[PDB]
């Protein structure tokens, strides 16, 4: 990602450096690069580990006792709403 970004920024039109802030290029080249280098890998690993553990757990629970999956529909419904609403608000709060 970084090599492609750096080899495609420099070979640029004059209008690109003209019409944009002389900080936005640098900001999205430093802060974003650091985030996607040393902060994104762990986030992806954590998400994958947690969701796989949860899925396997709910699978074995469902396999053991059938009545759980009859209760799955309500709980799952609940999950969706939570998994929706947080994600809408949290970002805004973080952006503050």
């Amino acid at each position: 990602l970084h090599h492609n970004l750096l080899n495609k920024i420099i070979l640029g039109p004059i209008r690109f450096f003209d019409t944009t802030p002389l900080g936005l290029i640098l900001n999205r080249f430093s802060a974003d690069t650091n985030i996607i280098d040393q902060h994104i890998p762990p986030t992806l690993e954590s998400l994958t580990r947690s969701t796989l553990l949860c899925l396997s757990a709910i699978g074995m629970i469902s396999y053991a006792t059938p009545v759980f999956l009859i209760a799955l529909a309500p709980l799952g419904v609940a999950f969706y709403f939570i998994q929706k609403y947080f994600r809408v608000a949290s970002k805004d709060l973080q952006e503050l």
């Binding site: 802030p21 900080g23 936005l24 640098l26 900001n27 802060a31 650091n34």
Partner: protein, 366 residues
């Protein structure tokens, strides 16, 4: 879990468009607007810090009378069920104590006895029977396979108490239903106002005009029109009158404030010296802190209830230079009006000077 432990990145670089774009205004007005009363009634003032007077249970009853029809049935039903249940429990306890349950169970396990000469309240044997006996006593059904013998006076006390309380409940609920049935014409108010206001030229001076109409096939009696201007002023000696409401005449053939409301109308208001609209010009009347209120009063002959209808105008909505299209038109055999041309306005020759000068420079030409 501890998202940002690595706190080291700080003040490395941000240096960006946050406000230093220089081609976009940094400021965000956000455009909040405050009017004296909302466009659709609902005077929006702010009372606060008022010495409160507490509450009293008569207010709770007052709420009981004013309910939507889908809640009166619910409170009715709940009241009835709770009363029947409560007295059923009282009767069940009475039956338990006096030794009636045991007597009936023991002499009905073996049918040899057939004895009902010494019982407090005949043929009450379970809570089911008690909750069917209480039904037979409250609603005045009285099925009567369950008499009350005369002996145990506690039962008689319970009967007197329950009959009287049941009558109270019946009377109050009947009263609520009748009161809500009598005041049933009183749906709401449906007075339709034009939204946009013109300042045309007519009869040698300017104007101030809008349109108003009804929908109910009953016209409104002794209708009165009042027009006021809301602005902050001070005395020449300098005192802050926070939101001075000034009354201004609405023109009429004899200078009286009644109007007869059957086909929609123009409500003129000639600008003259005393009027606060003496000093407002064309390019001026987009920037001003003013609010013109209109107050319509009358009675509806059907329901016999006095009604007051409110609306509000600001200088921003008012569009100089227009007038109202003649909504009426002589049809094939009978007059008619299309309310679809309500907010429609057209433009015609409009002087751009101020009425302050429309007599100062005495040429009807501007």
């Amino acid at each position: 879990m501890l998202a940002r432990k690595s706190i080291i990145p700080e003040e490395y670089v941000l240096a960006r468009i946050a406000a230093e774009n220089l081609r976009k205004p940094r400021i965000r007005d956000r455009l909040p607007k405050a009017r004296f009363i909302a466009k659709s009634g609902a005077c929006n003032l702010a009372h606060k810090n008022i010495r409160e007077q507490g509450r009293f249970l008569q207010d709770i009853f007052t709420t009981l009378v004013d309910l939507k029809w889908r809640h009166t049935l619910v409170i009715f039903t709940m009241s009835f069920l709770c009363s029947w249940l409560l007295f059923a429990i009282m009767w069940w306890l009475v039956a338990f104590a006096h030794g009636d349950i045991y007597a009936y169970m023991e002499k009905g396990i073996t049918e040899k006895s057939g004895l009902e000469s010494a019982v407090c309240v005949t043929n009450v044997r379970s809570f089911t029977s008690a909750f069917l006996f209480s039904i037979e006593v409250q609603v005045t059904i009285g099925f009567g396979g369950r008499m009350m013998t005369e002996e145990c006076p506690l039962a008689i006390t319970v009967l007197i108490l329950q009959n009287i309380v049941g009558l109270i409940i019946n009377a109050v609920m009947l009263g609520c239903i009748f009161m809500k049935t009598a005041q049933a014409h009183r749906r709401a108010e449906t007075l339709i106002f034009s939204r946009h206001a013109v300042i045309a030229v007519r009869n040698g001076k300017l104007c101030f005009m809008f349109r108003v109409g009804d929908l109910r096939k009953s016209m409104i009696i002794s209708a009165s029109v009042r027009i006021q201007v809301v602005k902050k002023t001070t005395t020449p000696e300098g005192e802050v009158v926070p939101i001075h409401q000034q009354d201004i005449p609405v023109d009429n053939p004899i200078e009286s404030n009644n109007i007869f409301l059957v086909a929609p109308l123009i409500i003129c208001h000639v600008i003259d010296k005393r009027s606060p609209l003496y000093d407002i010009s064309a390019t001026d009347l987009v920037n001003q802190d003013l609010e013109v209120i209109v107050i319509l009063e009358g009675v509806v002959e059907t329901t016999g209830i006095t009604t007051q209808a409110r609306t509000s105008y600001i200088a921003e909505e008012i569009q100089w230079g227009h007038r109202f299209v003649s909504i009426v038109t002589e049809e094939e055999g009978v007059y008619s009006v299309d309310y679809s041309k309500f907010g429609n306005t057209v433009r015609v020759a409009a002087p751009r000077c101020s009425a302050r000068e429309l007599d100062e420079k005495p040429s009807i030409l501007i």
